[PDB]
Amino acid sequence: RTIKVFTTVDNINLHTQVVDMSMTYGQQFGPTYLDGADVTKIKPHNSHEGKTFYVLPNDDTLRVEAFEYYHTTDPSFLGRYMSALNHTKKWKYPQVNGLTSIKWADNNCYLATALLTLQQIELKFNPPALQDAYYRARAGEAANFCALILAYCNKTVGELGDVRETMSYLFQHANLDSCKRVLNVVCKTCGQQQTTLKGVEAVMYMGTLSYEQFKKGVQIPCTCGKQATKYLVQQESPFVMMSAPPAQYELKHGTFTCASEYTGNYQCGHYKHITSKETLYCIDGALLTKSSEYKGPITDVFYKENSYTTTI
């Protein structure tokens, strides 16, 4: 009438639990999962002896273990993660030019170019759940990592994601504390004004795709009301993310790390990934295409960096 099972929220700290065989797992634990499979509606079987089941945090011990692994206090995070994992566990994660991509399914193209981008930039995540899942994503088992991204971004499978918003969500769970960016906006109604940015804001800019033009100076509307020019004074980061509203942009080999292109119907479009190696490669899910240059509606371009100091 009883079996011994183990319940967990992080698959690290296991918890011995006795369950009645006449009552389902849902009546005893609430929502319960056995390796991504929903077993809430199922009564415990003989073959479930000693197996490990995923459950939701419903006491002090499970909530603190879920907080130390996922770095979140959201009580619904694990459920939204299990809901996405039920789909991401079915996706194909082929190795494309040494990078782990995703075959297209349920508008996951923004997740693919984000996953392909993360494998080319230096970035260390703070939540242990994100670190462990990314390491496995490198090996072609990205089901846990994609379900975590969807949970952290609070997006469901099938929704159109934004690469810039997605990376921004991931950067806020990454160790970018030591990153620093120094900017200076020149004009005439103000003259000069220098600001310093730290963390996530130091590695992202919206308005220009060219990292070189960001150093030469871009024109922005300043509240002063003049022909204001913003230029990069100092950059201390392992990478930079340049983003802009989509227009026709020319990518050349060796001048960047990787980029993202957005095409199709704008409300519900499609993302592609362009990476720079010995030449330019376009990764569209599992499809690989190589060319010397690339012309298209680019939205995000990533560049490598260590320490920049302007000479102007």
- Dig out the tokens for 199 from the structure: 């963390």
C-beta closer to its own copies: residue 92 or 198: 198
Q: How far is the CB of 106 from Zn ion (least distance, A)?
A: 9
| Cβ distance to Zn ion smaller for residue 155 or 173 | 155
Among residues 40, 119, 126, 263, which is the contact residue for its own copies, using CB under 8 A? 40
**48-56, 109-117, 221-229, 236-244 -> range binding Cl ion (CB under 5 A):** 109-117
| Residues 116 and 258: beta-carbon distance below 8 Å | yes
Residues whose CB falls within 8 Å of the CB of residue 197, separated by 6 or more in sequence, listed in order: 180, 181, 182, 183
Specify the residue, 64 or 139, whose C-beta has the smaller distance to its own copies: 64
Question: Is 153 labelled a binding residue?
Answer: no
Strand partners, 180: 198, 236
Binding-residue pattern over the window 42 to 71 for its own copies, x denoting contact by CB under 8 A: ---------------x--xx-xxxxxx---
* Virtual torsion, Cα 38, 44, 46, 48, nearest 10 deg: 40
C-beta closer to Cl ion: residue 6 or 104: 104
Site for its own copies in 226-265 (CB under 8 A): 244-247
Instruction: Let me know the angle formed at the C-alpha of 270 by 291 and 272, rounded to the nearest 5 degrees.
Output: 25
* Separation in Å, CA 36 to CA 23, 83, 128, 306: 21, 9, 19, 40
Determine, following the binding rule CB under 5 A, whether residue 103 of this chain makes contact with Zn ion.
no
222 marked as binding residue: yes
Residue 224 annotated in ligand binding: yes
Report 264-293 residues binding its own copies (CB under 8 A).
Answer: 266-267
What CA dihedral angle connects 277, 283, 288 and 290, to 10 degrees?
Answer: -40
- Give the residue, chosen from 6, 104, 231, 249, that forms a contact with Cl ion under the rule CB under 5 A: 104
Could you list the active site residues? 109, 270, 284
Residues near Zn ion (CB under 5 A) are 109, 270
Residues near its own copies (CB under 8 A) are 12-13, 24, 26-28, 30-31, 40-41, 57, 60-61, 63-68, 73-76, 79, 154, 187, 189-196, 198-199, 206-208, 218-221, 244-247, 266-267, 299
